[PDB]
């Protein structure tokens, strides 16, 4: 009746001040596998965002006590979730506030990839002024294709049919009901490769869809198609987007996630004209700061009853 | 039988093909006010986008014959209509194809400003990596006050409520039915200064509005308000936008249009962290390139009946 929780990484003071109301809080951020292993032993719950090595060894190390683990935010594959339920351990994540701030930061990438809000604000801050150089295109009647109709890339579609596009998605595991409701149509894979002016990636990087965007799939697309990637940057074979952009098969690209974050400074899509990159800012809104902080706080507490 | 039309400025290729169908077409782009005067004398129609030396002096030089003159684009005040009024001249503009893709490039300035898509893509192409500097804001439950419920600001409300915002607009001239129809509430002026998380300018620069936004104006606003000017930059007393972006009353500002274009290099709004400046790109989309070209072509062809 004074439970105890390890905060492994920095966390929103909205949240922490909840936990300090129903627990004891260890805010020892960033701990070597050792400090964790020695700490885990003595604490009923652990909370982590995509950065703490949680896996078999951390699980064994605790021996009872550790009843529930809270992952802060988007992904989950942080934790070896197999050992979780195995050593009888609960696993709760925080995905409502980080989906918003995600589907938001993609809309912001698509609209601003289309009008060159970057390279223009570049040349004008750089003393230049070439209106003929940075002439946008028009996300209205333009078919947008979405790969991975998850929670993110559906709250994207929700938004893009508000901008007025004809939006389609492709994911075998998406209920034709929830897609037809939000206003989307569910269509085949090559119907989404070909017939698209805008492409929005939302596929989990697995050995099943890795390097999917190679050079066999760039030819299928309509030439001049535009790509926005905000969910697992490995799914693109980056050295073919380096080449469909230079050649002209892909018109423009706007990438938030990468194969290796941070990509080396030579990295050819990071340094390029038709690209507009942000450094996994996907969920970086001050409202999903407080929002994920509070919602795990509320999750942990619930499962730690 | 064989009417005749002067094209003063470069005009879209589709429409020129339209004009050569029902006229002779002299595309004499960039005429000295003197050549204009001598030419106007012999032609039934003159067409001109934002930026041609038309006025009383040109009106008189033509002495009849010049029935109609078309402003290739949104603007209708490019010239002294008072003399066309006075000279039996007709006056036709392009009030639609440039309408859409201005509302568009408006939105895209709001969204790319919120998530710092410019200042971010910049420093990553600049070999930095600071996921913590370029932290956004979440345009969702947020109030967007649209100053001026023209055909521009309306169709920005259209998109903005689709990103899911609370949009109010204030222009004493828009029937509240045309407002409540698209889903927007009309309210007062100070209920737009004070309650706005986002302020979109769509005021034409009536003298009355020249330097409206001044330090009195900025003090009224909620601190943290973001200002997307995409209409006519004279309305902002730039020396004070600079001192609320600096002093932190204005959060960020996305500016497409300026007091004087192309501005002084050293212009503090042009060169500023919290400002995203594109250069009057408000129209530069190829669906309004061809779109305006063909609509005023259409517009003159009729007025020339």
Residue numbers in the entry:
A (entry chain B), B (entry chain A): 83 to 387
Article, verbatim:
To elucidate the molecular mechanism underlying enzymic activity, we first purified the full-length DEK20 for crystallization. However, no crystal was obtained due to relatively flexible interactions between RBD and SBD. Consequently, we purified a truncated version (residues 1-387, referred to as DEK20WT), which includes only the SBD and the NBD. DEK20WT forms a homodimer, with each monomer composed of 1 NBD and 1 SBD. Both domains exhibit conserved architectures: the SBD contains 5 α helices and 5 β strands, while the NBD consists of 7 α helices surrounding a central β sheet. Indeed, both the superimposed cofactor (NAD+/NADH) and the substrate (3-PGA) from human 3-phosphoglycerate dehydrogenase fit well within our structure. The 3-PGA is situated in a cleft between NBD and SBD, stabilized by a series of positive residues such as arginine and histidine, while NAD+ occupies the binding pocket formed by the NBD. Interestingly, a conserved residue His at 284 among different species was located between NAD+ and Ser282. In the structure of DEK20WT, Ser282 formed a hydrogen bond with His284 (3.2 Å) keeping the imidazole group of histidine away from NAD + . Correspondingly, the decreased enzyme activity of DEK20(S282L) was also restored by the H284A mutation. These findings demonstrate that Ser282 is critical for enzyme activity, facilitating its interaction with His284 to keep His284 away from the cofactor, NAD+.
